[PDB]
Design a binder for this molecule. Structure first.
Ligand code: FES
Ligand SMILES: [K+]
Ligand SMILES: [K+]
Ligand SMILES: [Mg+2]
Ligand SMILES: [Mg+2]
Ligand SMILES: [Mg+2]
Ligand SMILES: [Mg+2]
Ligand SMILES: [Mg+2]
Ligand SMILES: [Zn+2]
Lengths: 77, 232, 109, 50, 115, 190, 164, 52, 291
RNA sequence: AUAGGUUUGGUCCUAGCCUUUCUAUUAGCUCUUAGUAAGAUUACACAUGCAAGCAUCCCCGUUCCAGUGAGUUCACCCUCUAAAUC
């Protein structure tokens, strides 16, 4: 791809990107659908984040890990 | 049929040995030419004979005419037969490493279906003897007479399983991977059994060959090893 | 997470004491020859902080990694002297010894 | 490694030039109303803003 | 490698051969090449129906959840796949495209009736 | 023309085969012509090229009575090691590449049809536990929307926007408007 | 033939026959042994036969030797915590030394099995990629799926040339 | 509601752990506030065009 | 309650009835070969090796569990009618999380109608094979399991090979597994080839099938003819335990039958061919007396 | 390497060179169709056309992708800890 230092093409110096036409009903329904979808997805995302953090907690300072460490120390002694 | 090459005498069959003056017939014996040389003129031939059931021999014949040399060598060979012991009548009883003069021979016992992957002269002699599965590597000077003499010496000086059992007074138990952990007793002493077990040598002081270990570890890189070849 | 120094505990022989409060120690490790599959000694020099200047050339010492390097080449400190040169105490019996013979018998105690 | 001092010099002088040539809002956000372009950069505004 | 910014994203890396596409679902830095270095392979997707008339999607749901919980983004095709699996809600654009297709087929049926 | 084409195995039990080959394999007496002591690592592509045989045809091609068919079990056994059950590579018997491929396919077909013996190992079970009580293999409680016939989420369904919002959109996008769309068909038109 | 007495020691099979995999605490092994004296025979054999195996299974542990410095042979282990474990080996056989060090400071078989199981997880059989890492390169190697066009040409209708 | 597959997996996990609750799993969204796309952003965090 | 196939008592009876022939259990395999190894052994060492081989055979002869046919999976997770008609082929989603048992693994199908349902048992097995390939199993069903090929295999007396293929291909509780095992057992019964399965892990399942289907006459006859009287008596006892309310068990209780008397009671009460059972028992007793 | 040929009036030994095998490039002569894969010798010089936009203005992006192998222990592990995502 081009870099910031490459000149613009002369074939498209007078090119204006025209916006697409909008269907009002579909546009409105789609905005509402995106809103609801993104709320649901963000809720799911934070649950996954909390699951990951909880797994880290139980892998570092969990009861089972602590008991395993104590068992190892007792066998060593 | 041709021999080892189109213009080579080696490998060519001479037919059965002639009926000896003793009155015996040798129709079950086959003869193969191993070498034909011009002596400066006369002809010196090295031939080998064998019945395919462990009895085999070799001899040199010298004569002005080639056919007379063939006949002399064949007739003398049949009266100097070695008997070669074969494990299950297809291979040798153990690995045999030998040196005859400057020629070295390393022979390895192999399972059934392995074939004769050996020097061509060794293939001929093994077919005459009746060995069907063996590996052999020849090193040093490749001299045909020395090769034959060393091969026959090593094959005649092998210890059978029964001989080992009698010597050690212990069961010789065979372990096969295809048969699982089942112990197969292949030889038992005719005499009494020792009740003291063999010393469990933690590390034996055996003389290993670098080529075999190199092959085992995957450091052997020869483009000539394990090449596809016709059935032998 | 206790130190930034790679080698944490190492045993070596003191080969130099010409520095102030710093002992030059020789550390041997076993390295496998990839071809011969035999182990050979590979040597590495370490500098150990000796605050009390108690090292003598030839003695076997143990070095512990510092929490951080105190100098360019000083990254370890002398935890103890395993074998003082010519003044070895048999760890098994706790008696002074000279080579393979006891200087004082274990039975004396 | 041969220390690269020209790189440091270039970075320092470029930083100095930036901090002493900070454009002002009157220059950055001026607009040509006939062509609807920013004179500072020459970039045209999007059509939906025109 | 070190990039200026960027993030992890779970996306489809294209392999296979000409006229036979296949996708590997991978979590990768968004600045990396499409079929280049990745952090972990999270599944696969065969877009061609097999002899049973099935499109096969393998999803490592545990690891997908792990990487979403570690801050990884999702590409739109991956979101649509997860919606089809029922792991996410149906993406808005799948619904909208379904409605557009329904309207187009209705127009075609009306044309047939008019003729 | 072979009278055994329909029923190939008869040729192996016919007397003519017994004089020609005896009890030895059909490839025993073949020797390939090549330079050097080390043969080439691949055999010729095919001994029959445009209905013409080469000077030294392979064991299969010399004898038009020998038919490579998955039912011709006694012939196929000659190309498999009886001690290891491995199909010989082509240089071993000298068969050309074409006939070697045909023999491999025939041997595999005969094994798949149970006509050719091969070692079938005894394997361990896939699963340590055979219970089928988990919800993945059982019935999950239906969700209220599913039993009620409703979509999983209300926004899956189309709801006509109020006229005020539509007029708002028409003002916002004046001059760049498509024809307004109504509710979609209830089901996919065919 | 291979040089030296007991050349089998210089084979990876022998080197991997070792069964002593030290816990993560062990950092250093110092081995004091006497060249002469029957009571140290096993210790001498320990140096000759089992040190290569121990080092092979534990590449990061510093193993060092000392000859005729003390009247009796012994092993000393230095742990990460700074603790020192002394194991007298006089009158013991080399196999006994192996068993003792395995028992006191060697990972049990169960831990090794969990480590192996943890290793198994990295090479997921479902993943597709190079043969170095994966069982299969492409889904086209799975029976029933559309095969590779290299071996079986796709029908003309599935090819862009005859769809354009 | 949870998505169908996530709901099924949650119910399966509960049933495997011995719970027999018939209460539908639910995803909480009162904490996720739908912020309009045209709400003002933080002008303090925004960048500035560089002189050139 | 009625004993299960895995009960310790039933397991012990079937284990002793199966037998343990080391030569048959460890028959030479036709496979890639390596040079054998050799060891010098005393009598004590040889006996130790034989006992270790017997233990290995016991592990090898472990019986597969007998399971009931799995119920078909017909469960719908969702019906998104909006998707109806937008796709022409179904999507199969397999959860490939490594540390999950294959019977707890979620495998779902999105149909062209928009229905998200659970995969059927056959689809589950196919997908598990696709993503967790097992040595010996095929994604597509081998043709050897057709009727004609199974008949050929039985004609060659390769019933154990058929059962090994079935074990490698199908799950124990699948319809195909049960059908193939039942067909093999029926063939063995109809041509009296029970000895084919002795010293294998399939003998116990064959005996269990015969007992639950009340067709132990042929196996009892074979055991009598092979002088395996303990096995025949144990078979009668197991039959009585599985059918404690049958006239045979009641007759045994009434007559206080023990040993061969159990066989006689069974022959007179609940034997389809009790006359031949009596004839064979009488011949066996005469031969025993003469010997 | 399963080896083979070649020193002599002749035998044996040693030793070099070469043959047989498998790839890649180029050249000669000769070449029908289909699918797939791969594809300047040169870090020598380059005509021409394209390869970066998007977006209600702010910002964001053009620091990626793509290319080459000139130079050359900056790549891997541990410690510590910025920027970035959540
Ligand atoms: S490698 Fe899979 S389609 Fe070619
Ligand atoms: K922008
Ligand atoms: K370079
Ligand atoms: Mg010629
Ligand atoms: Mg030479
Ligand atoms: Mg490109
Ligand atoms: Mg790049
Ligand atoms: Mg930060
Ligand atoms: Zn041919």
């Amino acid at each position: 791809r081009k870099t910031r230092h490459d000149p613009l093409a002369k074939s498209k110096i007078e090119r204006v990107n025209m916006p697409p036409a909008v269907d009002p009903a579909e546009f409105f329904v789609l905005m509402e659908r995106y809103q609801h979808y993104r709320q649901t997805v963000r809720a799911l995302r934070m649950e996954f984040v909390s699951e990951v953090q909880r797994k880290v907690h139980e892998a570092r300072a969990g009861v089972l890990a602590e008991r395993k460490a104590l068992k190892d120390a007792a066998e060593h002694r | 049929e041709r021999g080892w090459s189109g213009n080579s005498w080696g490998g060519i069959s001479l037919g059965p040995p002639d009926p000896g003056p003793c009155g015996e017939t040798y129709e079950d014996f086959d003869t193969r030419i191993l070498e034909v040389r011009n002596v400066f003129k006369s002809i010196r031939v090295l031939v080998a004979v064998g019945n395919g059931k462990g009895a085999a021999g070799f001899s040199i014949g010298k004569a002005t005419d080639r056919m007379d040399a063939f006949r002399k060598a064949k007739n003398r060979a049949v009266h100097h037969l070695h008997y070669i012991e074969r494990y299950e009548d297809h291979t040798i009883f153990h690995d045999i490493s030998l040196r005859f003069k400057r020629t070295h021979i390393k022979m390895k016992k192999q399972p059934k279906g392995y074939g004769l992957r050996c020097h061509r002269a060794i293939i001929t002699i093994c077919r005459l003897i009746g060995i069907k599965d063996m590996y052999a590597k020849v090193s040093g000077s490749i001299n045909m007479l020395s090769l034959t003499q060393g091969l026959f010496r090593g094959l005649s000086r092998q210890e059978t399983h029964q001989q080992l059992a009698d010597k050690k007074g212990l069961h010789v138990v065979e372990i096969r991977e295809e048969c699982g952990p089942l112990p197969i007793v292949v030889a038992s002493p005719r005499g009494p059994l020792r009740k003291d077990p063999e010393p469990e040598d933690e590390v034996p002081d055996v003389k290993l060959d670098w080529e075999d270990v190199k092959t085992a570890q995957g450091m052997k890189r020869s483009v000539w090893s394990n090449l596809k070849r016709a059935a032998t | 997470v206790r130190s930034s120094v790679h080698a944490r505990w190492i045993v070596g022989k003191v080969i130099g004491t010409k520095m102030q409060k710093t002992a030059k120690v020789r550390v041997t490790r076993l390295v496998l020859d990839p071809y011969l599959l035999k182990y050979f000694n590979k040597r590495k020099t370490y500098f150990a902080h000796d605050a009390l200047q108690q090292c003598t050339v030839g003695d076997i010492v143990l070095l512990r990694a510092l929490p951080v390097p105190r100098a360019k080449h000083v990254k370890h400190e002398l935890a103890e002297i395993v074998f003082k040169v010519g003044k070895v105490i048999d760890p098994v019996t706790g008696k002074p010894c000279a080579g393979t013979t006891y200087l004082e018998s274990p039975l004396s105690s | 490694v041969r220390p690269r001092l020209i790189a440091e010099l270039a970075r320092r002088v470029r930083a100095l030039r930036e901090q002493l040539n900070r454009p002002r809002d009157s220059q950055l956000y001026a607009v040509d109303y006939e062509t609807l372009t920013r004179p500072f950069s020459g970039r045209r505004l999007p059509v939906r803003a025109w | 490698k070190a990039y200026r910014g960027g993030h992890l994203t779970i996306r489809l890396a294209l392999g296979g051969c000409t006229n036979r596409p296949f996708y590997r679902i991978v979590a990768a830095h968004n600045k990396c090449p499409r079929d280049g270095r990745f952090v972990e392979q999270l599944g696969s997707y065969d877009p061609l129906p097999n002899s049973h008339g099935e499109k096969l999607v393998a999803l490592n749901l545990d690891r997908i959840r792990h990487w979403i919980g570690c801050g990884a983004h999702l590409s739109k095709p991956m979101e649509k796949l997860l919606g089809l699996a029922g792991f996410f809600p149906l993406h808005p654009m799948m619904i909208t495209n379904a409605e557009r297709l329904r309207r187009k087929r209705a127009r075609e049926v009306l044309l047939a009736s008019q003729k | 023309i072979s009278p055994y084409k329909d029923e190939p195995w008869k040729y192996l039990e016919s007397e003519e085969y017994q004089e020609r080959y005896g009890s030895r394999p059909v490839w025993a007496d073949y020797r390939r012509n090549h330079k050097g002591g080390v043969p080439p690592q691949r055999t010729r592509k095919t001994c029959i090229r445009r209905n013409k045989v080469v000077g030294n045809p392979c064991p299969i091609c010399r004898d038009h009575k020998l038919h490579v068919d998955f039912r011709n079990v006694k012939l196929l056994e000659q190309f498999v090691c009886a001690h290891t059950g491995i199909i010989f590579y082509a240089p071993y018997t000298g068969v050309c590449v074409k006939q070697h491929k045909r023999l491999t396919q025939a041997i595999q077909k005969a094994r798949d049809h149970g006509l050719l013996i091969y070692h079938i190992p005894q394997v361990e079970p896939r699963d340590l536990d055979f219970s089928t009580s988990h919800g993945a293999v059982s019935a999950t409680p239906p969700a209220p929307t599913l039993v009620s016939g409703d979509p999983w989420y209300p926004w899956y369904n189309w709801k006509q926007p109020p006229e005020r919002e539509l007029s708002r959109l028409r003002r916002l996008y004046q001059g760049h408007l498509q024809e307004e769309s109504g509710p979609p068909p209830e089901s996919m038109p065919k | 033939p291979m040089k030296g007495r007991f050349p089998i020691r210089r084979t990876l099979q022998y080197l991997s026959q070792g069964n002593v995999v030290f816990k993560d605490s062990v950092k250093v092994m110092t081995v004091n042994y006497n060249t002469h004296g029957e009571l140290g025979e096993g210790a001498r054999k320990f140096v000759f036969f089992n040190i290569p195996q121990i080092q092979y299974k534990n590449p990061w542990v510093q193993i060092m030797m000392f000859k005729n410095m003390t009247p009796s042979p012994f092993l000393r282990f230095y742990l990460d915590s700074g603790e020192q474990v002394l194991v007298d080996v006089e009158t013991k056989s080399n196999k006994e030394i192996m068993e003792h060090i395995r028992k006191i400071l060697g990972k049990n078989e169960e831990t090794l099995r969990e480590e192996e199981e943890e290793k198994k997880q990295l090479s997921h059989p479902a993943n597709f990629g190079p043969r170095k890492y994966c069982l299969r390169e492409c889904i086209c190697e799975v029976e029933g799926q559309v095969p590779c066009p290299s071996l079986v040409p796709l029908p003309k209708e599935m090819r862009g040339k005859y769809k354009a | 509601p949870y998505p169908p597959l996530l709901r099924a997996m949650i119910i399966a996990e509960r049933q495997k752990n011995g719970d027999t609750s018939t209460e539908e799993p639910m995803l909480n969204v009162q904490r996720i506030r739908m912020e309009p796309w045209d709400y003002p952003a933080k002008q303090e965090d925004k960048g500035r065009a560089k002189g050139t | 309650k009625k004993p299960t196939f895995m009960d310790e008592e039933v397991q012990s009876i079937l284990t002793k009835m199966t037998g343990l022939n080391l030569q048959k259990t460890f028959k030479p395999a036709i496979q890639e070969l390596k040079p054998p190894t050799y060891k010098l052994m005393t009598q004590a060492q040889l006996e130790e090796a034989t006992r270790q081989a017997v233990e290995a055979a016991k592990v090898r002869l472990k019986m597969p569990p007998v399971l009931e046919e799995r119920v078909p999976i017909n469960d719908v997770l969702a019906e998104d009618k909006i998707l109806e008609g937008t796709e022409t082929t179904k999507y199969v989603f397999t959860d490939i999380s490594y540390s999950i048992p294959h019977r707890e693994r979620f495998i779902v199908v999105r149909e062209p109608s928009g229905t998200l349902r659970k995969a059927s048992w056959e689809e589950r097995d196919r997908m598990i094979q696709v993503y967790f390939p097992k040595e010996g199993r095929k994604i597509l069903t081998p043709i050897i399991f057709k009727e004609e090929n199974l008949r050929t295999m039985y004609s060659q007396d390769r019933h154990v090979d058929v059962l090994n293929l079935c074990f490698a291909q199908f799950e124990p509780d699948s319809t195909e597994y049960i059908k193939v095992h039942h067909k093999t057992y029926e063939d063995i019964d109809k041509r009296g080839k029970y000895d084919l399965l002795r010293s294998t892990r399939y003998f116990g399942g064959m005996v269990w099938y015969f007992v639950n289907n009340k067709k132990i006459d042929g196996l009892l006859i074979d055991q009598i003819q092979r002088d395996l009287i303990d096995d025949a008596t144990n078979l009668v006892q197991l039959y009585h335990v599985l059918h404690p309310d049958g006239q045979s068990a009641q007759g045994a209780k009434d007559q206080a039958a023990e040993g061969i008397n159990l066989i006689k009671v069974f022959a007179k009460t609940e034997a389809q061919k009790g006359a031949y059972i009596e004839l064979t028992l009488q011949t066996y007793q005469e031969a025993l007396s003469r010997h």
